Amino acid sequence: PPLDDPATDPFLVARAAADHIAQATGVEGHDMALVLGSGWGGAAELLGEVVAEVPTHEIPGFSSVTRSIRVERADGSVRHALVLGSRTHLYEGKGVRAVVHGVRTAAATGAETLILTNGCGGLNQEWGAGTPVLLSDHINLTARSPLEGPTFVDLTDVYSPRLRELAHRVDPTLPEGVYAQFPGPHYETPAEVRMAGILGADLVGMSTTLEAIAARHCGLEVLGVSLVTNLAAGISPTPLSHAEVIEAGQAAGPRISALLADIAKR
Amino acid sequence: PPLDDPATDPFLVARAAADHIAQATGVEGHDMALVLGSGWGGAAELLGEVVAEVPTHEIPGFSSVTRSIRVERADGSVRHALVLGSRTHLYEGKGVRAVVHGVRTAAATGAETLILTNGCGGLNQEWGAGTPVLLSDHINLTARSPLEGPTFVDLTDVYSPRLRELAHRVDPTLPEGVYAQFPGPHYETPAEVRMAGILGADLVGMSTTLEAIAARHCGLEVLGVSLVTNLAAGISPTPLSHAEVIEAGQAAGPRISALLADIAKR
Amino acid sequence: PPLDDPATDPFLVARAAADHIAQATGVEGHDMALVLGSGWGGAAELLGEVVAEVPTHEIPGFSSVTRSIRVERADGSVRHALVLGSRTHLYEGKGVRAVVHGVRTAAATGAETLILTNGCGGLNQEWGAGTPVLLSDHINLTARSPLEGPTFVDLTDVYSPRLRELAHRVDPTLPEGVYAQFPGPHYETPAEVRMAGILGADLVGMSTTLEAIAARHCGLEVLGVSLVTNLAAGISPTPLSHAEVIEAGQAAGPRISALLADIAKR
Ligand SMILES: [Ca+2]
């Protein structure tokens, strides 16, 4: 059933997606799921052992590799982590269903915790390029919603305070910030960046909030972690060259992947 | 002709809709129309004597009973109130046309007065669950408009001071506020609520402004009445539980319906 | 290939448009392009000699005359200015592709400079109807983007400082301001206008920022100039009558056409 055909039940496609994953990986259920965003592609390498790789295009509802990872905990029990292959942005024009399909598919596999990551611009000068930041809340500015009916979900604590405390048990120095989602793909003008600050954002980017909303609706607990690609337009007096942004991003690789691995164990 | 098809003239469907109503009800023209939002469902029981009921799905352009009520005034004169059967929200994705069809239809029956009610979240701590609030102005945050083409409607006084003054005759204590409309169906996070306050809203909800813009365009006089379902996210340190909100909503029922009934007679 | 079909490549239609123009006008390439907004219809009559007029509906992708003008410079050299036909607005419902097609056609003829003009509402009382204002930056509030993929374009200086310097050589008294685009077609309510000032806007309208984004993606230097049609709702304690607004705009005609004529020669 095509996800973009309005008559299709997106959750039925999620179910079929999960089933496909259960039999292609041999894992009956996953416990947590991760979405690797810009700057986070190598960040799942230290998480544990890869149990299976599933070309994403072969999973119902999508269209590079989805990974099933076994995570060893302190007490010897294990966890299965679903690492989603790639991510669909609103600016690709495929509709909001394709954007949150990965999240609904993860919840259908039985996952309870969702770790959303992204690359983004920061409005706070203390957080230079390469700095990871925990999301405390968000402002969705895309004028779009992933929910399609009379939906009763409370979004008072989208980003689980429980998980934010855990992250702080792992690294007490991570700051927290409100993230604003712009439709994109073009970046914000200095006036739009001042606008976001006046509205209460510390970070701007192009994803995550619709995924968080869909996660909550499916009852997932959410941990959001941004990597500041660099300071947003007009924030820095002397803005970083593109080469500099890339290098600062690279050099954050080890830290960032050690953080997800430690967090995945709790 | 399907309201859906871009070629179709929405106003001609509304014309057919009024003609059907006049014929099905026996009432050649209506004087006022009421749209009952969340929590206002039975608020039209004291309006007057039901003259007719029309299965809404049988009226051109719709797809629940629409009622024609005889309102009896002080000086024995009578008015006919059109109580529209259903309401189509923007978040259902049926297009902005289906959202304002009821308003354009009321205009075509010749009802010059439109009473728009809704349920919303309040930002003012003085207005707890159950408080009816008069709309003094609005902020449309849906990035949508019900008008197609070069239709330059002046929205300087969308909500008629004249009608607010009459509302104050029935209850001089009613407060007034600026309502902000988000696309929905989800509610706002505490950060979005704070943003709404910064922008100047006192109330947040998910309907009404598109309807109010189309009403003006048709030359209707509009009364907007919001029912605070409860304080919005992060406004109260002591949030009411879902059961309490429902209960508070039920208890306002009587007050609320006496209010419309009195306002309807003027 | 209809621009309308998602499959069509917009830029290929732009190429066709441009080859068509070069042929119909005999001008191999143009150097600059101008879009005349509301209040600017007669402001290109002093630009230079009209080399050719092309009915717009005849150029690939459009659907009321486009003109190729010869600009004689001080040193005896010449330039060819492409003066675009009307302008397609977002509120017309034909999609973002149709809105920025003129800009991409211009780029395709080789133009390196784009002058965008519009008529807008002002929020600064020091700028009465008739005041032309240079655009220093903008705030796009339509929740749309003309870019279709990971088009990672920098908007840190959408409105060229070079061009604002030159405009200032012609008339050093021109002020600069931040422009906010609303989808329209309805005008803003006094609450919405207050909202725009809180967000940092000095001017509100319904066009331009999408065209500006598409122009910068194509590498054009952009000059934006607004003509305040009048004060936005609630700004003026004393609202101008229609007669006044119209007369203020006509009184501005000479000043505006002289401005572009002088700028066009640099
Ligand atoms: Ca009448």
XYZ file of N, CA, C and O in Angstrom, chain A residues 38 89 91-93 141-143 182-192 194-195 198-199 206 232-234, chain C residues 137-141 143-158 178 198-200 210 213:
216
model
N 22.861 14.782 10.244
C 24.097 15.288 9.634
C 25.203 15.371 10.615
O 25.051 16.037 11.622
N 13.674 14.207 4.752
C 13.362 15.575 5.174
C 12.107 16.066 4.496
O 11.749 15.619 3.375
N 11.744 18.853 3.137
C 12.086 19.579 1.913
C 12.316 18.720 0.700
O 12.739 19.216 -0.356
N 12.077 17.426 0.834
C 12.261 16.551 -0.295
C 10.902 16.429 -0.973
O 10.745 15.807 -2.005
N 9.897 17.017 -0.359
C 8.587 16.950 -0.960
C 7.889 15.599 -0.962
O 7.099 15.310 -1.854
N 8.387 25.307 13.416
C 8.008 26.460 12.518
C 7.760 26.047 11.079
O 7.888 26.843 10.172
N 7.360 24.816 10.855
C 7.149 24.386 9.507
C 5.681 24.521 9.147
O 5.329 24.264 8.007
N 4.836 24.863 10.107
C 3.391 24.910 9.865
C 2.831 23.524 9.451
O 1.743 23.426 8.860
N 12.798 24.724 10.867
C 12.435 25.541 9.706
C 12.232 24.563 8.578
O 12.819 23.493 8.559
N 11.323 24.859 7.673
C 11.195 23.875 6.605
C 12.411 23.580 5.764
O 12.623 22.418 5.344
N 13.253 24.587 5.536
C 14.416 24.396 4.688
C 14.021 24.211 3.229
O 12.840 24.331 2.891
N 14.969 23.838 2.331
C 16.403 23.543 2.504
C 17.378 24.745 2.601
O 18.536 24.609 3.069
N 16.929 25.927 2.143
C 17.771 27.112 2.204
C 17.967 27.407 3.699
O 17.165 26.973 4.523
N 19.038 28.120 4.049
C 19.342 28.484 5.418
C 18.679 29.789 5.793
O 18.137 30.484 4.948
N 18.732 30.122 7.066
C 18.128 31.326 7.563
C 18.963 32.594 7.330
O 20.187 32.567 7.401
N 18.283 33.718 7.078
C 18.971 34.981 6.891
C 19.266 35.498 8.292
O 18.660 35.031 9.265
N 20.253 36.409 8.428
C 20.512 36.939 9.763
C 19.183 37.445 10.469
O 19.002 37.272 11.705
N 18.253 38.056 9.707
C 17.003 38.523 10.328
C 16.167 37.322 10.784
O 15.472 37.405 11.783
N 16.193 36.230 10.042
C 15.409 35.042 10.482
C 16.034 34.366 11.753
O 15.335 33.848 12.628
N 17.688 36.131 14.033
C 17.352 36.977 15.186
C 15.933 36.655 15.575
O 15.598 36.613 16.740
N 15.086 36.448 14.575
C 13.699 36.124 14.802
C 13.576 34.886 15.716
O 12.832 34.894 16.704
N 14.470 35.576 19.260
C 13.384 36.289 19.950
C 12.285 35.337 20.286
O 11.558 35.536 21.235
N 12.108 34.317 19.472
C 11.020 33.399 19.770
C 11.432 32.366 20.857
O 10.581 31.650 21.345
N 16.644 21.753 10.312
C 15.564 21.307 9.456
C 14.934 19.973 9.649
O 14.430 19.356 8.653
N 24.855 30.074 13.549
C 23.886 30.526 12.539
C 24.252 31.936 11.975
O 24.997 32.695 12.608
N 23.726 32.265 10.790
C 24.002 33.588 10.137
C 23.869 34.803 11.083
O 22.901 34.911 11.869
N 24.908 35.646 11.044
C 24.990 36.855 11.848
C 25.347 36.682 13.306
O 25.457 37.660 14.033
N 17.330 43.077 4.387
C 17.217 41.631 4.711
C 15.709 41.351 4.688
O 14.873 42.294 4.552
N 15.355 40.069 4.823
C 13.943 39.677 4.884
C 13.698 38.559 5.887
O 14.634 37.987 6.464
N 12.428 38.277 6.095
C 11.947 37.223 6.995
C 10.860 36.546 6.188
O 9.865 37.164 5.841
N 11.068 35.289 5.819
C 10.081 34.559 5.019
C 9.128 33.875 5.959
O 9.557 33.001 6.752
N 7.860 34.270 5.921
C 6.852 33.715 6.789
C 5.856 32.891 6.011
O 4.743 32.675 6.465
N 6.444 29.729 5.068
C 6.711 28.322 5.410
C 6.996 27.552 4.124
O 6.804 26.336 4.087
N 7.430 28.253 3.067
C 7.707 27.594 1.794
C 9.113 27.969 1.385
O 9.727 28.847 1.973
N 9.641 27.241 0.400
C 10.960 27.457 -0.118
C 10.890 27.176 -1.582
O 10.086 26.391 -2.022
N 11.646 27.923 -2.376
C 11.625 27.653 -3.815
C 12.635 26.555 -4.141
O 12.687 26.070 -5.249
N 13.479 26.196 -3.190
C 14.491 25.175 -3.440
C 13.924 23.803 -3.195
O 13.142 23.597 -2.263
N 14.321 22.871 -4.050
C 13.763 21.529 -4.016
C 14.638 20.410 -3.491
O 14.178 19.304 -3.356
N 15.883 20.639 -3.164
C 16.616 19.501 -2.633
C 17.663 19.985 -1.671
O 17.618 21.126 -1.212
N 18.629 19.125 -1.320
C 19.664 19.576 -0.409
C 20.400 20.638 -1.111
O 21.506 20.456 -1.623
N 19.759 21.738 -1.168
C 20.291 22.851 -1.855
C 20.810 23.694 -0.733
O 20.095 24.433 -0.089
N 22.073 23.541 -0.471
C 22.593 24.290 0.626
C 23.292 25.569 0.264
O 24.533 25.622 0.132
N 22.403 26.574 0.077
C 22.661 27.996 -0.246
C 22.672 28.932 0.977
O 21.755 28.919 1.842
N 23.706 29.778 0.994
C 23.942 30.750 2.056
C 23.109 32.040 1.797
O 23.157 32.594 0.712
N 22.309 32.472 2.771
C 21.504 33.687 2.617
C 22.022 34.794 3.574
O 21.309 35.708 3.969
N 23.295 34.733 3.927
C 23.850 35.725 4.834
C 23.834 37.148 4.300
O 23.907 38.098 5.085
N 23.772 37.298 2.972
C 23.686 38.632 2.382
C 22.876 38.568 1.116
O 23.376 38.738 -0.005
N 21.603 38.292 1.321
C 20.700 38.174 0.212
C 20.655 39.467 -0.613
O 20.705 39.417 -1.849
N 13.749 45.834 6.924
C 13.583 44.402 6.857
C 12.158 44.124 6.450
O 11.209 44.578 7.082
N 7.361 42.853 16.281
C 8.074 42.113 17.341
C 9.109 41.165 16.674
O 10.227 41.025 17.146
N 8.763 40.546 15.547
C 9.744 39.668 14.907
C 10.905 40.379 14.266
O 11.859 39.713 13.837
N 10.818 41.711 14.126
C 11.932 42.439 13.521
C 11.718 42.980 12.092
O 12.665 43.429 11.462
N 10.794 34.745 -1.730
C 10.967 33.478 -2.452
C 11.774 33.746 -3.748
O 12.677 32.980 -4.120
N 15.432 34.266 -2.929
C 16.121 33.016 -2.565
C 16.425 32.313 -3.862
O 17.547 31.948 -4.122
